[PDB]
Amino acid sequence: AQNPNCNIMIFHPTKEEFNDFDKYIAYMESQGAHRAGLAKIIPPKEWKARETYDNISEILIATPLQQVASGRAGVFTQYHKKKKAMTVGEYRHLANSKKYQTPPHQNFEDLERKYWKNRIYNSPIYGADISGSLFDENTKQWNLGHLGTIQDLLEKECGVVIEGVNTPYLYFGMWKTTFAWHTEDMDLYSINYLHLGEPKTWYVVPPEHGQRLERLARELFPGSSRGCGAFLRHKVALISPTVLKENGIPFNRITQEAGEFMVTFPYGYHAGFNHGFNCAEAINFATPRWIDYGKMASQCSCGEARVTFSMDAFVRILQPERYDLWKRGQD
Ligand SMILES: O=C(O)CNC(=O)C(=O)O
Ligand SMILES: [Mg+2]
Ligand code: NI
Ligand SMILES: [Zn+2]
Numbered sequence: 321a322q323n324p325n326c327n328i329m330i331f332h333p334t335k336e337e338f339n340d341f342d343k344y345i346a347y348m349e350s351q352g353a354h355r356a357g358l359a360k361i362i363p364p365k366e367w368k369a370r371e372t373y374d375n376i377s378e379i380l381i382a383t384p385l386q387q388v389a390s391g392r393a394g395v396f397t398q399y400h401k402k403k404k405a406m407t408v409g410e411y412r413h414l415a416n417s418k419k420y421q422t423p424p425h426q427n428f429e430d431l432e433r434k435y436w437k438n439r440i441y442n443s444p445i446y447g448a449d450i451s452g453s454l455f456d457e458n459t460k461q462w463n464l465g466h467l468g469t470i471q472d473l474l475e476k477e478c479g480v481v482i483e484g485v486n487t488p489y490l491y492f493g494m495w496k497t498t499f500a501w502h503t504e505d506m507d508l509y510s511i512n513y514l515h516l517g518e519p520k521t522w523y524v525v526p527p528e529h530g531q532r533l534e535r536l537a538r539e540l541f542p543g544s545s546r547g548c549g550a551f552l553r554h555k556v557a558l559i560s561p562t563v564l565k566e567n568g569i570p571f572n573r574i575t576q577e578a579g580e581f582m583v584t585f586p587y588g589y590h591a592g593f594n595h596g597f598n599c600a601e602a603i604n605f606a607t608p609r610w611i612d613y614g615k616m617a618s619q620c621s622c623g624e625a626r627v628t629f630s631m632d633a634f635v636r637i638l639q640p641e642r643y644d645l646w647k648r649g650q651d
Pocket of ligand 4: 554623
């Protein structure tokens with residue numbers, strides 16, 4: 321078995337190898353990359369997502385989210401308070417303010433320490449889940465707005481034709497902005513490109529060990545656990561590396577820098593934080609190996625996680641028994 325310790329792998333494709341996305345994902349899996357739950361892909365030196373970022377300040381963040389934490393430093397939840405709309409220009413200025421900017425630090429490790437020590441005492445503002453793309457339409461390789469769609473993958477593999485579309489989303493982050501422990505909707509893959517700015521640190525649990533994370537989370541958030549049989553779908557719970565180590569949960573960490581792609585694999589729990597002002601683009605995708613994960617994916621039926629028009633059809637076809645009670649939570 322390749323990569324038996326489930327280490328995060330880093331790949332450096334040539335421009336020639338960067339021409340066939342599906343084939344490269346299959347290559348990475350042949351090398352055991354999926355066992356980690358997360359892989360880094362450094363694009364060929366000749367590749368660019370776009371010519372410049374010089375005119376992005378006019379993008380609107382219609383509902384910036386203030387991430388308010390409750391709990392203790394290593395075990396907390398966050399809630400998103402909606403704020404008034406602001407432009408990317410306005411948001412960047414806020415990120416750079418004395419109140420919100422990245423603190424002095426020695427290196428990524430000192431900054432990680434400061435994050436876990438201090439996150440709960442601040443409420444950073446996140447411009448998340450903004451439909452759009454920053455790839456130039458002439459970028460032909462690894463353009464997240466030109467990928468084959470999940471609906472077309474299900475059609476090719478299973479023969480069924482369903483409604484729905486699949487488009488990317490932009491994320492504008494600042495120091496301490498946080499993504500809680502989650503897998504993707506329907507345990508899909510995701511791909512994330514860090515277009516610009518300061519890094520993003522990721523933590524990931526190997527898919528083969530995901531249930532160990534779930535069991536810990538039920539112990540650490542016991543009322544959440546009673547309210548919903550899949551509450552990590554709410555994307556509110558954080559657990560520090562220290563806590564994971566104290567409880568024997570296998571995990572890995574890696575820092576993504578501007579210009580790099582990350583891939584999350586089916587049922588790879590992941591969480592992380594941003595080091596400073598940045599802009600990422602991400603989208604979910606499928607391969608044939610995903611289909612069995614989609615059939616087995618947990619769902620939130622308490623009604624909190626409340627998910628997309630396109631996810632309806634996935635549940636309908638892959639989880640017909642659930643269909644019924646799941647759409648009761650979504651209607
Ligand atoms: O970048 C973020 O805030 C969160 N992204 C993801 O969880 C992803 O790409 O799967
Ligand atoms: Mg603009
Ligand atoms: Ni994700
Ligand atoms: Zn729920």
